[PDB]
Design an enzyme around this catalytic site. Structure first.
Site, short mmCIF file in Angstrom:
data_model
loop_
_atom_site.label_atom_id
_atom_site.label_comp_id
_atom_site.label_asym_id
_atom_site.label_seq_id
_atom_site.Cartn_x
_atom_site.Cartn_y
_atom_site.Cartn_z
CD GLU A 117 -31.39 8.67 12.77
OE1 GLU A 117 -31.80 7.86 11.92
OE2 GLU A 117 -31.97 9.75 12.98
CD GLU A 154 -31.88 13.71 13.37
OE1 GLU A 154 -32.89 13.05 13.04
OE2 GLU A 154 -30.82 13.67 12.77
ZN ZN Z 1 -29.59 12.58 13.71
#
Ligand code: ZN
Ligand code: ZN
Ligand code: ZN
Ligand code: ZN
Length: 353
Positions: free
Chosen positions: A171, A279
């Site tokens: 991220e 994710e």
């Molecule tokens: Zn992640």
């Protein structure tokens, strides 16, 4: 199964680690494996956290194929508890293991008290000061030392190392983590990633890792955008991304999931990598408001498998009654293109060169 050649970040990786890569290279064009964070250590319906149960198993009668954990189970103070036993149980089942880094802030980690100070979520820029030459390089090295010792002793019943897909500094195209895009130039982030891989592989002799890169989803879905903070083909085995969407009015977001998956799939083919969705979930506010999408999983699998590029991802990993959500997930399981733990075979003993 016949011999194939694989090119990994770690040119001396164990046979089982090489086989895992080879497995995903073949498997990814025949299915998408289901992954779940904390699969057998956290759940709403489990009564033991010893690695024998999961919400997934209680819903559909099989475990996730891919088991996600993170360094809150490895690096002191190990707030999530150890996962060695649970990893070994998963591996004994023929499961695939992935661990993401969630390192404390090396510049501020002695200041812990008031959350989020000193954690991953402490936005204080710590990339520049954690590279060699930086005052906090020894602190980062301490984290990496513990990851390495963990990996180096992570052994099955025969004393052989268990392969792990280790996902570093995720991220990173947002600014909520100390390694993020307000906290480093693109080059500084690349150096952090490369330095960390090199430290694990060369300084500490880790031989059982595949390395994954996973920025956020892009809304301007281009190779150039993905490449801005990409550590490079010499440093990454697995091309992923992370995406969290709205519970309602999510057609646009699902199209974006598919678009990003298609991009990494095309890049992965060109570069000899494994493409994944590292994710995926519903943004945290919507879940804490008790909202739900009882078509979420059906939309996910239908969108991915219809797209000729996005379908080629090896896995997607999800991160955390009477509302129709169980039936949705059961449909996702029943889908011919999804693969759970019993649906994968011969992962780790494939011959490679
Ligand atoms: Zn992640
Ligand atoms: Zn095939
Ligand atoms: Zn965790
Ligand atoms: Zn930004």
């Amino acid at each position: 199964v016949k011999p194939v050649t694989v090119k990994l970040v770690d040119s001396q990786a164990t046979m089982e680690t090489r086989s895992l890569f080879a497995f995903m290279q073949e498997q990814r064009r025949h299915s998408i494996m289901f992954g779940h964070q904390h699969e057998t250590t956290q759940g709403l319906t489990i009564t033991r956290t010893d690695g024998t149960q999961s919400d997934t198993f209680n819903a559909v009668g099989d475990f996730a194929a891919v088991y996600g954990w993170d360094t809150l189970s490895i690096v002191a103070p190990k707030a999530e508890g150890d996962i060695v036993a649970q990893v070994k149980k998963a591996y004994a089942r023929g499961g695939i293991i992935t661990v993401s880094s969630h390192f404390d802030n090396p510049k501020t980690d002695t200041q812990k008290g008031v959350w989020p100070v000193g954690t991953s979520w402490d936005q204080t820029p710590a990339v520049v000061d954690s590279l060699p030459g930086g005052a906090y390089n020894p602190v980062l090295n301490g984290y990496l030392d513990q990851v390495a010792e963990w990996a180096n002793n992570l052994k099955d019943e025969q004393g052989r190392l268990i392969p792990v897909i280790f996902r570093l500094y995720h991220e990173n195209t947002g600014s909520w983590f100390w390694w993020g895009d307000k906290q480093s130039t693109p080059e500084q982030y690349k150096q952090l990633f490369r330095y960390s891989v090199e430290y694990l592989r060369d300084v500490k002799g880790v031989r059982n890792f595949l390395y994954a890169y996973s920025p956020n989803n892009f809304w301007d879905v281009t190779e150039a955008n993905y490449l801005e903070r990409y550590p490079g083909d010499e440093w990454v085995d697995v091309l992923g991304f992370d995406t969290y969407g709205p519970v309602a009015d999510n057609a646009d977001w699902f199209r974006n999931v598919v678009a990003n998956a298609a991009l990494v799939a095309r890049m992965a083919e060109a570069r000899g990598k494994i493409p994944v969705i590292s994710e995926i979930g519903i943004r945290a506010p919507d879940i804490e408001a008790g909202l739900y999408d009882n078509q979420w999983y059906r939309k996910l699998i239908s969108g991915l498998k219809a797209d000729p590029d996005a379908r080629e991802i090896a896995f997607l990993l999800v991160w955390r009654i009477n509302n129709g959500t169980l039936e949705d997930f059961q449909a996702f399981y029943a889908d011919e293109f999804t693969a759970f733990n019993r649906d994968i075979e011969q992962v780790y003993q494939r011959p490679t060169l």
